[PDB]
Write a protein that binds this ligand. Structure first.
Ligand SMILES: NC(=O)c1ccc[n+]([C@@H]2O[C@H](COP(=O)([O-])OP(=O)(O)OC[C@H]3O[C@@H](n4cnc5c(N)ncnc54)[C@H](O)[C@@H]3O)[C@@H](O)[C@H]2O)c1
Ligand SMILES: NC(=O)c1ccc[n+]([C@@H]2O[C@H](COP(=O)([O-])OP(=O)(O)OC[C@H]3O[C@@H](n4cnc5c(N)ncnc54)[C@H](O)[C@@H]3O)[C@@H](O)[C@H]2O)c1
Ligand SMILES: CC(=O)N[C@H]1[C@@H](OP(=O)(O)OP(=O)(O)OC[C@H]2O[C@@H](n3ccc(=O)[nH]c3=O)[C@H](O)[C@@H]2O)O[C@H](CO)[C@@H](O)[C@@H]1O
Ligand SMILES: CC(=O)N[C@H]1[C@@H](OP(=O)(O)OP(=O)(O)OC[C@H]2O[C@@H](n3ccc(=O)[nH]c3=O)[C@H](O)[C@@H]2O)O[C@H](CO)[C@@H](O)[C@@H]1O
Ligand SMILES: [Cl-]
Ligand SMILES: [Cl-]
Ligand SMILES: [Cl-]
Ligand SMILES: [Cl-]
Ligand SMILES: [Mg+2]
Lengths: 347, 345
């Protein structure tokens, strides 16, 4: 009977998570300001309109910015939330380094405000979207939760780190709060229906969408950012994790909250690292198309290799990433093929 | 632009700095929300009313909160600022650990709003009130700017480190910004006049005001937080710096901004550390009163010794603290004796 508030719920990870919540019997209330989500023909973001169709369950949604104090207050007054899953924020589009204040305002002040509003309304259960970037340049691998944090590169990563810190202090000061900080690795793939997925606007900054776009025939070749790293093939290595697994990890996080767990931090990754070339190859296999690429200059601030140690999460969260590489690629391909130009309003 | 905005200008360090600004020929505009400042009988906070009286120069003031975006907008439209000295914030009333959100809201969100307005109005010159707390538990002494920072014990100190980091990022992103981050050590003392000084409410958390309150007779005895540290006498050692010198350091920071220095960080300390007992003794000498004390348990999170390496500030800012221990004690006593109840009741 008590709701779960989902901020930034119309985005990539958020939409997939709303779907999992609905299927698991939860009742979400979703907010988003369309900063990086496509408007549908109706009131709902297209992503969520599709989630409603897929699940056969209604999606409760309000267009709203987490920076809008009054709206946020009214929302918390109107419903009785039992928890909040916070995805809303700015993510690097390689942008952060150039616009620190936007990241500090949206991510930092936006989250402080949300926490204040939560406290004031007696909602002290949170699931926070963190990231492997908080670990900075890996000092060792795989990255376990004990790996040093902070020392992050850009404003985006620092914003995530500062937020983690704040929540940690909050839990320390008030034993009644429960917060699960989830450090995601590299989310990829799409819901198996092929109806929703990652919907980038313009030239994708991330690997996977660029690859699929080449495979679909929109882009000519993949620009590989350096091949001189200290890795097996010289190309960057990352722990790619299926968005569906990631979304399910959120449900696990809600259950953890119910245990009155205090502050907990978990990596959400598969524990397996793949290089850029390995991802291209898997995409060629999924797509049944050759995927050309060209090696270009390294990208500023890029790390050589990053991958998780997912044992804490398996142990404490009762969660593991069930989907493999081919699944990720096949699911991404399905979304891409069925939606050559991403989301669009209904015909 | 011409004017200098002084946030939290009605506070301890800020009011002394406003005085110095006025004496140096600057034109300040002060804002404060009275969160930790005493209101006078007029518009001005008592501290500033006094500064006005002492300098014979007017104090331009506006009561407002840094968290008020609308008020910030109006302020920046009304005046043409050339720089901003940012003192406004919450300090540990030992509190931080217990009220993180208040600290993060006022210190982080407030500073971010200020930086935004500054950016909006093209006022990209800032002097920020930082603290030696950012260094965390000292790895070596004295503390130079190169010592590691972050990994702060508390929400208050963390807030300070996060702010420095944000400012660093801002300066990186926009080379037109100039920012001087001043890491204060342990501010003490008062203006020579004895008319203004630190005005704590309730039982003071800091050593000096507690000491002065014992001497004046407001407190029975000083509780000494441990005598078993690895210090010459077993008690905590700190770099006590006269608030007047600190205020003067802000003027040196202003001149630094004019060089188009980008982001610079400096310690504001004397480089001389004194123990709790040494301070007690020096205050007995200054006040002519006895200051009884009792040794109690160590205070959670306390560091044995902390003091500055003042070289960089001397070399780069061209500033050094001139007033020593006796002077600090003499000035602190005068303020306390002459104002037994602080600014008012
Ligand atoms: N995708 C990744 O690789 C990745 C990795 C690390 C952590 N994260 C974090 O996880 C979260 C979700 O990432 P994602 O890939 O789904 O990104 P996304 O951009 O698709 O999702 C974020 C959603 O937040 C919304 N939003 C942005 N600012 C808002 C505001 N002020 N008020 C309300 N809504 C606002 C956007 O419109 C968007 O729908 C983000 O916080 C992101 O930083 C993602
Ligand atoms: N005194 C110290 O020992 C010490 C140590 C190092 C750094 N600092 C920092 O130096 C600064 C000044 O310290 P101080 O001793 O003068 O403290 P203070 O409390 O006397 O001065 C702060 C002033 O800011 C005002 N203020 C607080 N919140 C405000 C808000 N939201 N809007 C507007 N005004 C607001 C308060 O009313 C007060 O007058 C603070 O940033 C403090 O954290 C102080
Ligand atoms: C949303 C997000 O948090 N992105 C961050 C994440 O990126 P991260 O590197 O994890 O993820 P990407 O998808 O951008 O890149 C994955 C890998 O593919 C490579 N690649 C990617 C795209 C492309 O067109 N060509 C190519 O060769 C990258 O160099 C990397 O080796 O960590 C990086 C390093 O800390 C940061 O710089 C990014 O801001
Ligand atoms: C760990 C820390 O960051 N603490 C704060 C404290 O520093 P800090 O601890 O240095 O300063 P204090 O004035 O509180 O104490 C100075 C010394 O006196 C001792 N003492 C103090 C009071 C008392 O009643 N009895 C006693 O014995 C302390 O143990 C210490 O050794 O004030 C600074 C501003 O002034 C703040 O910037 C700091 O956030
Ligand atoms: Cl409800
Ligand atoms: Cl007045
Ligand atoms: Cl003016
Ligand atoms: Cl001094
Ligand atoms: Mg393990």
């Amino acid at each position: 009977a008590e709701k779960v508030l989902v901020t930034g719920g119309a985005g990539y990870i958020g939409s997939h998570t709303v779907l999992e919540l609905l299927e698991a019997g939860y009742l979400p209330v979703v907010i988003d300001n369309f900063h990086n989500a496509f408007r549908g023909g109706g009131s709902l973001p297209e992503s969520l309109r599709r989630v409603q169709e897929l699940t056969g369950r209604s999606v409760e949604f309000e267009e709203m910015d987490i920076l809008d104090q009054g709206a946020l207050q009214r929302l918390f007054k109107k419903y009785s939330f039992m928890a909040v899953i916070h995805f809303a924020g700015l993510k690097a589009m390689g942008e952060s380094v150039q616009k620190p204040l936007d990241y500090y305002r949206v991510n930092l002040t936006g989250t402080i405000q949300l926490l204040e509003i939560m406290k004031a309304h007696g909602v002290k259960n949170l699931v926070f979207s963190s990231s492997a970037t908080v670990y900075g340049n890996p000092q060792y691998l795989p990255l376990d939760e004990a790996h040093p944090t902070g020392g992050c590169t850009n404003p985006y990563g620092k914003s995530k780190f500062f937020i983690e810190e704040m929540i940690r202090d909050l839990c320390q000061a008030d034993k009644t709060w429960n917060v699960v900080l989830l450090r995601y690795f590299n989310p990829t793939g799409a819901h198996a229906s092929g109806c929703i997925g990652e919907d980038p606007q313009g030239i994708p900054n991330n690997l996977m969408p660029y690859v699929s776009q080449v495979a679909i025939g929109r882009r000519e070749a993949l620009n590989v950012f350096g091949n001189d790293y200290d890795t097996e093939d010289g190309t960057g290595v990352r722990d790619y994790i299926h968005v569906v697994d990631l979304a399910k990890g959120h449900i696990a996080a809600l259950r953890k909250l119910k245990e009155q767990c205090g502050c907990r931090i978990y990596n959400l990754g598969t524990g397996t690292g793949y290089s850029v070339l390995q991802m291209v190859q898997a995409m060629e296999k999924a797509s049944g198309k050759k995927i050309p690429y060209k090696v270009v200059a390294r990208r500023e601030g890029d790390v050589a290799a990053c991958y998780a140690n997912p044992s804490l999460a398996q142990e404490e969260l009762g969660w593991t990433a069930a989907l493999g590489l081919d699944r990720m690629c096949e699911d991404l391909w399905r979304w891409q093929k069925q939606n050559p130009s991403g989301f669009g309003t209904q015909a």
